[PDB]
């Protein structure tokens, strides 16, 4: 089949689940809490063991009251509805979801290799072949998501998890949205924001392709193309219309980056008549066998070190806090459909 045809069928699969979402498919007491793997403003991700199977999972736990205070109700409903409907090699679909008086719970495949962020900062930068290996998986994932009319909106190393085989999972769908037109919400991470977001224009999925340019730059340079100590200074840089590349960047890398980090939407790669093929058929991707990446048959350039199925040495240590469940239901109406 063509990719077109593969995607069309994946859309039929997605849409059935999108229109009739799974709801209340487990309970907290079915899991043993192991370790906090990360924290957000309104929640955390923990490693848990599912007792009936002994499988390990990542459990994202969101405090309903905190979600409400941060005006993230609709975004949170988006995340759960989308994640329970998708299926792709580089995504972690929801295995289960449920809620209780206090919290929302989303249970996903656990990625034991840790955050790309951690390895990238420690090692310093990745070689071009290394960066390319990751980038290809992102390119396929976005092609999938965009075909389902989904915009992702928070690409960054912090949210690219490495699996046992050294492949990646694109996680944190907190800003993901199914939208056919343009959308307007100011969201994302300062370093990764497209100019049109910063300038409060309506925008579309082209913001994901700009974000990819930021990521590939960061992976290959070891620092992002636009940085400063404060967000406002970062936004001045992004809109300014200039980017400098490290002398070690290949000619093909720089050319790809100029076409991704392009302020002009009529010229930005991924956004043109030829769609994602402008990116896939670019010279920097010449050695990339897209079918082999999708199949996860390419040998990963780097594989994290493990000693166990729930080893967590690739994660930072976070203060372990209780998972408290109030005796009173909080925010029932807001999260009715979750």
């Amino acid at each position: 089949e063509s990719v077109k045809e593969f995607l069309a069928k994946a859309k039929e699969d997605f849409l059935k689940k999108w229109e009739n979402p799974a709801q209340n498919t487990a309970h907290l007491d079915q899991f043993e809490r192991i370790k906090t793997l990360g924290t957000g403003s309104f929640g955390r991700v923990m490693l848990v063991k599912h007792m009936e199977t002994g499988n390990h999972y990542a459990m994202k736990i969101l405090d309903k009251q905190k979600v409400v205070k941060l005006k993230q109700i609709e975004h949170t409903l988006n995340e759960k509805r989308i994640l329970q409907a998708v299926n792709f090699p580089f995504l972690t679909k929801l295995e289960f979801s449920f809620k209780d008086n206090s919290n929302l719970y989303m249970v996903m495949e656990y990625a034991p290799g840790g955050e790309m962020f951690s390895h990238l900062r420690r090692i310093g930068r990745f070689s071009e072949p290394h960066a390319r290996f990751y980038a290809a998986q992102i390119v396929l994932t976005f092609e999938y998501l965009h075909s389902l009319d989904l915009i992702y909106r928070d690409l960054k190393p912090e949210n690219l998890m490495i699996d046992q085989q050294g492949y990646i999972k694109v996680t944190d769908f907190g800003f993901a949205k199914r939208v056919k037109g343009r959308t307007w919400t100011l969201c994302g991470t300062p370093e990764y924001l497209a100019p049109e977001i910063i300038l409060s224009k309506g925008y579309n999925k082209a913001v994901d392709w700009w974000a990819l340019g930021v990521l590939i730059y960061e992976m290959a340079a070891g620092y992002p193309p636009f940085f400063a100590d404060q967000p406002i200074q970062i936004y001045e840089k992004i809109v300014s219309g200039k980017v400098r590349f490290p002398s070690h960047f290949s000619s093909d890398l720089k050319d790809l980056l100029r076409n991704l980090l392009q302020v002009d939407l009529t010229k930005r790669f991924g956004n043109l008549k030829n769609g994602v093929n402008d990116i896939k058929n670019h010279k920097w991707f010449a050695t990339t066998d897209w079918i082999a990446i999708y199949q996860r048959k390419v040998e990963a350039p780097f594989i994290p070190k493990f000693k166990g199925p729930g080893d967590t040495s690739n994660f930072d240590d976070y203060e372990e806090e209780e998972i408290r469940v109030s005796i009173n239901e909080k925010c029932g109406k807001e999260f009715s459909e979750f």
Binding site: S41, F117, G124, F175, C187, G188, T189, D229
Partner: peptide, 20 residues
């Protein structure tokens, strides 16, 4: 160097999402 400027900056740790 640009590397030295990055490492000295306040944004080498995990970066929080923003919103309106």
């Amino acid at each position: 160097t640009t590397y030295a400027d990055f490492i000295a900056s306040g944004r080498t740790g995990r970066r929080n999402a923003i919103h309106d």
